[PDB]
């Protein structure tokens, strides 16, 4: 349907990893561009792809208004405040530690990691490099036919959902300063377009 | 050379990335990788393994996981250092019988640990925060240029924690190509490799790590029992 009634029946074939804790979620490394519609922090060609794909999708059918993606801009240009300068690797000091009486020093290393509740969530887990994933039951999931019959998956996106995808973009959009030049240039891009 | 002088001078590949032989800069405890000429910072990062997994014709011992193996980078050195008679045999009984008696296994005794939650607010936005802690090892040998430490990370399709060895020296320890120990103040050449003396100077070093990995789990102490009792019975 048009305008409100869009939706997006999203398929995911099962960066898609099946896990369990009904205790079984999907693990989706979602992305939100690939290798043209704008230039990326590497100087790369890159387009629109997944969560950038949705976000577009919404604003052309009138779901998204341009008000949200211009607060999302503003609040991405002004944040001083990134996830990766936020979030910082622990390492103790050694203490002597025996194990079958050899004598070792012992430490631990410590790697944050944030969980955003939305059911639904987002996770933040740790050179090294900050790696979000969006996770979700599985049975949510409409089959090739389109029931959820699993209790090729289709993730079924709509207006009663879509403030998911767009918090998402904001949280990519402060995960770092690569992401951050990215979002950047994606909200441009669908601002202008 | 012969006898008492027997020595081995381990060819190691420095200009590689992507394998077992790693560079890296100690800061003053912990150190970061590095790409530049060589200071005393500089250490060699080897995970060493002590055996291999071989064929229907050149195996020497059957593993822990039924494997037929043969030996291998540590165990092939304490070999030929037990085949030139400067390994004692009361050394290699001493870590059989340490290891038959022994209750203590790294993998046991070694916890990943995860951290309560805390709110935490980033550019306004409220997440929870948690930890996940790592333990590491070290164990300082008595040469006190050489040391190894063991990484403890989840089993991969398992339950419980393993633990990687790495074997750590000074890069300024390598001989070059002539025997040279002149990598201090000077750069690594493309595709150059590092000679590391192994002596009867020096042996005991790769003794005390066969203990070590004989107390990593079940699977460890076997195999390393199965390797002792195959070179003492050589």
Not at 41 to 52: C, F, H, P, T, V
Not at 88 to 98: A, C, G, H, S, V
Not at 178 to 190: G, T
């Given at each position: 349907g048009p305008?409100?009634?869009?939706?997006?029946?999203?398929?995911?074939?099962?960066?898609?990893?099946?896990?369990?804790?009904?205790?079984?979620?999907?693990?989706?490394?979602?992305?939100?561009?690939?290798?043209?519609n704008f230039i990326g922090?590497?100087?790369?060609?890159?387009?629109?792809?997944?969560?950038?794909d949705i976000i577009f999708?919404?604003?052309?059918?009138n779901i998204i208004l341009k008000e949200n993606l211009f607060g999302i801009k503003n609040f991405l240009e002004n944040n001083e405040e990134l996830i990766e300068d936020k979030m910082?690797?622990?390492?103790?000091?050694?203490?002597?530690?025996?194990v079958a009486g050899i004598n070792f020093l012992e430490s631990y290393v410590s790697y944050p990691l944030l969980v955003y509740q939305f059911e639904f969530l987002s996770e933040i887990i740790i050179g090294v490099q900050?790696?979000?994933?969006?996770?979700?039951?599985?049975?949510?999931?409409?089959?090739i036919n389109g029931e959820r019959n699993?209790?090729?998956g289709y993730l079924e996106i709509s207006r009663n959902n879509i403030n998911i995808f767009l918090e998402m973009?904001?949280?990519?959009?402060?995960l770092?300063?690569?992401?951050?030049?990215?979002?950047?240039?994606?909200?441009?891009?669908?601002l202008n377009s």
């Open positions: 305008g409100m009634k869009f939706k997006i029946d999203y398929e995911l074939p099962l960066k898609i990893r099946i896990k369990q804790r009904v205790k079984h979620y999907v693990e989706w490394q979602i992305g939100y561009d690939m290798v043209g922090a590497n100087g790369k060609d890159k387009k629109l792809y997944e969560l950038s999708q919404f604003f052309k059918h910082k690797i622990n390492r103790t000091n050694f203490t002597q530690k025996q900050g790696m979000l994933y969006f996770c979700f039951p599985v049975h949510l999931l409409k089959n699993f209790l090729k973009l904001k949280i990519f959009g402060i770092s300063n690569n992401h951050r030049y990215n979002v950047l240039q994606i909200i441009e891009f669908i």
